[PDB]
Amino acid sequence: SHMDALRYHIEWNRVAEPGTARPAGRLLAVISPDHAGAPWVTAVLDALGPDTVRFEAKGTDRAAWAAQLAQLREDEGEFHAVVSLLAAAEALHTDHGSVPLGLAQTLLLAQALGDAGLTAPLWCLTRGGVAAGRGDVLSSPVQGALWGLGRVIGLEHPDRWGGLIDLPETVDTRAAARLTGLLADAGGEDQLAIRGSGVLARRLAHAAPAVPGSGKRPPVHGSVLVTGGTGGIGGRVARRLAEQGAAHLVLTSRRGADAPGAAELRAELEQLGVRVTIAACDAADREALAALLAELPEDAPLTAVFHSAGVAHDDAPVADLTLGQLDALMRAKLTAARHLHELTADLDLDAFVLFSSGAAVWGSGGQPGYAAANAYLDALAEHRRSLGLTASSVAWGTWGEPEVHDRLVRQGVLAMEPEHALGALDQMLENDDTAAAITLMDWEMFAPAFTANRPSALLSTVPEAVSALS
């Protein structure tokens, strides 16, 4: 249909076995020195060999790292590639409580490498940051946020970007050889998972068409929490849930009842039969979210969460983004969704729906912070499924009803009709799919623009993109 046509999903397809030769030139491996003990980090360092030069990235000091890297670069000369093991630092930064240390250090490494004029391509390794292959378990949603940042590094600094590789639990000799083969030549792939059965690469595809009469979804009832539910997309979602018969909507936002349009929204809802509660609650404040959950009717237990809260504003290019800026974009995504997960993991929810963005699924220049924050949401939904909990991540393209909006439309990420977007989400939930992107694309405009500086193996499974590129 028109709604089926908006739904895409990520898949992982087997790619070629890489060659058997080490990289010819010298590698530079980057380690977070307080977070260098995980078995995978040892196994990677051992696979890179003892000739690899090691750089310990201490703290978060762009200027100091640029100077240390400038020194290596002259001492050691030009490198074949830079291999970052910073993702192993999953603890939150002490000054930026929504930013995992390894994400802050990866941004600063990308920036300091540019500052120092190191041009070897950067590869960012993760372990359990993606769900790739039948049965695979996404064990670290925090490392999953690095993929959102890495794809935007690829769009903003294509000439110095290697790619992303997830490692398996055990890095045996077949795994190690796959790794060092790809570092030698990856055949144009740049989003890769090394697994027991082979090397898999990330692909975007049209989702399967929706099946009438096949819905898995239980009927909307009880209490349903919509964060950012007072306006914007969350408001529209709340209105659909009211028509689909929710007993009770709990709508939160920073402003609550003072949010723009909140009062007229509550009055429209209530005309429908629905009990509305509007609260000024921020889900990144764990105490406040717990209090809101504590006051639910005995006859209206929480049955679903829709997390729409979170701004895109105040991002910046990779080369300029600050940690304070990254912390603000992270907070309403990672911090808030962590608290929603922890405080509902025991309830037996019907839906836990996290709203992500095309920035995190394919990448958008200018949006590294928002890409990393939305990529953590997609990763947390896959993680939750591994725990036998329901969860859904829906990555929106452009909504219909300033320069970043117009840029995206110009790049062929077209404004959707709200009804069709909301219709496609219902198709996703009826299928109980874990992840999708919901976007109207003009592939003739999008594919050439997205691939002008660097090819994309991601889009090879979208036939319209293949056609647009020739």
The C-alpha R_g of the chain, in whole angstroms, comes to: 22
Distance between CA atoms of residues 101 and 237, nearest Å: 34
Is 8 within any annotated ligand binding site? no
Write out the DSSP string of 154-192: HHHSGGGEEEEEEEPSS--HHHHHHHHHHHH--TT--EE
Is 437 within any annotated ligand binding site? no
Strand order across the 440-441 sheet = 398-399, 413-416, 440-441
Which structure tokens are listed for 60?
Answer: 């978060």
Positive or negative: CA dihedral 149, 150, 151, 154: positive
Is 338 within any annotated ligand binding site? no
Are the beta carbons of 67 and 194 closer than 8 angstroms?
A: no
Write out the DSSP string of 184-236: H--TT--EEEEETTEEEEEEEEEPPPP-TT---PPPP-SEEEEETTTSHHHHH
Of residues 246, 267, 254, 247, the one with CA closest to residue 227: 254
Is 120 within any annotated ligand binding site? no
Is 283 within any annotated ligand binding site? yes
163 backbone dihedrals φ, ψ, rounded to 5°: 160, -165
CATH number of 1-470: 3.40.50.720
335 backbone dihedrals φ, ψ, rounded to 5°: -65, -50
Would you state the torsion angle of the CA atoms of residues 218, 393, 377, 135, taken in this order, to the nearest 10 degrees? 90
Is 282 within any annotated ligand binding site? yes
Distance between CA atoms of residues 98 and 335, nearest Å: 6
Is 254 within any annotated ligand binding site? yes
Distance between CA atoms of residues 31 and 85, nearest Å: 5
DSSP-based three-state secondary structure for 31: strand
Q: Report how far apart the first and last C-alpha atoms of the chain are (Å, whole number).
A: 26
Which structure tokens are listed for 44?
Answer: 């990677």
| Tokens 């349903």 belong to residue | 224
| Residue 92 burial (CB count, 10 A) | 19
Distance between CA atoms of residues 65 and 55, nearest Å: 9
Tell me how far CA of residue 437 lies from CA of 95, 330, 348, 403, in angstroms: 33, 20, 25, 22
Is 216 within any annotated ligand binding site? no
User: What DSSP designation does 387 have?
Assistant: T
DSSP-based three-state secondary structure for 10: strand
Tell me how far CA of residue 366 lies from CA of 278, 289, 307, in angstroms: 34, 32, 24
Which structure tokens are listed for 222?
Answer: 């009880």
Is 312 within any annotated ligand binding site? no
Is 308 within any annotated ligand binding site? yes
Distance between CA atoms of residues 299 and 283, nearest Å: 23
Which structure tokens are listed for 357?
Answer: 């963005």
Domain ranges of the chain: 1-470
